[PDB]
Design a protein around this ligand. Structure first.
Ligand SMILES: *[C@@H]1O[C@H](CO[C@@H]2O[C@@H](C)[C@@H](O)[C@@H](O)[C@@H]2O)[C@@H](O[C@@H]2O[C@H](CO)[C@@H](O[C@@H]3O[C@H](CO[C@H]4O[C@H](CO)[C@@H](O)[C@H](O)[C@@H]4O)[C@@H](O)[C@H](O)[C@@H]3O)[C@H](O)[C@H]2NC(C)=O)[C@H](O)[C@H]1NC(C)=O
Lengths: 48, 36
């Protein structure tokens, strides 16, 4: 009915897979390098 | 120009104004006039 009366819903540019990929990259960066004071050149460090 | 039809499945009576040489399907609908 919505479409028959000329009301359309458009898809977002970024899919769910892309957002999940971004979050996975952020978590991996925190676990591996854990950059502090910004997001530049990752510096590896043991988690402990 | 290129034309995107949101509610048409062109994979392999189509409700499109005109066809072309670069009709193909995407996750956003049927696209005509653009090369992939
Ligand atoms: C737009 O339409 C396409 C094509 O739809 C086909 O044609 C229309 C007219 C109907 O007859 C459909 O039933 C036809 O499929 C859709 O793509 C199809 O999507 C379905 C559902 O996801 C797919 O079915 C799956 O296919 C797999 C097994 O099939 C295997 O063999 C076929 C060849 O016979 C091959 O294409 C496929 O890759 C496999 O090797 C499997 O994932 C699963 O079990 C299921 O059967 C079907 O394969 C798709 N067909 C094609 C040609 O891509 C689109 O989904 C539809 N788009 C939208 C947005 O709705």
């Amino acid at each position: 009915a919505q479409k028959f009366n000329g009301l359309t819903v458009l898809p977002p540019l970024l899919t769910d897979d892309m957002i999940a990929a971004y979050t996975a990259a952020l978590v991996s960066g925190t676990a591996t390098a854990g950059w502090t004071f910004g997001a530049g050149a990752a510096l590896q460090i043991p988690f402990a | 120009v290129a034309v995107l039809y949101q509610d048409v499945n062109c994979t392999d009576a189509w409700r499109i104004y005109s066809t072309g040489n670069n009709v193909f399907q995407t996750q956003a609908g049927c696209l005509i006039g653009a090369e992939h």
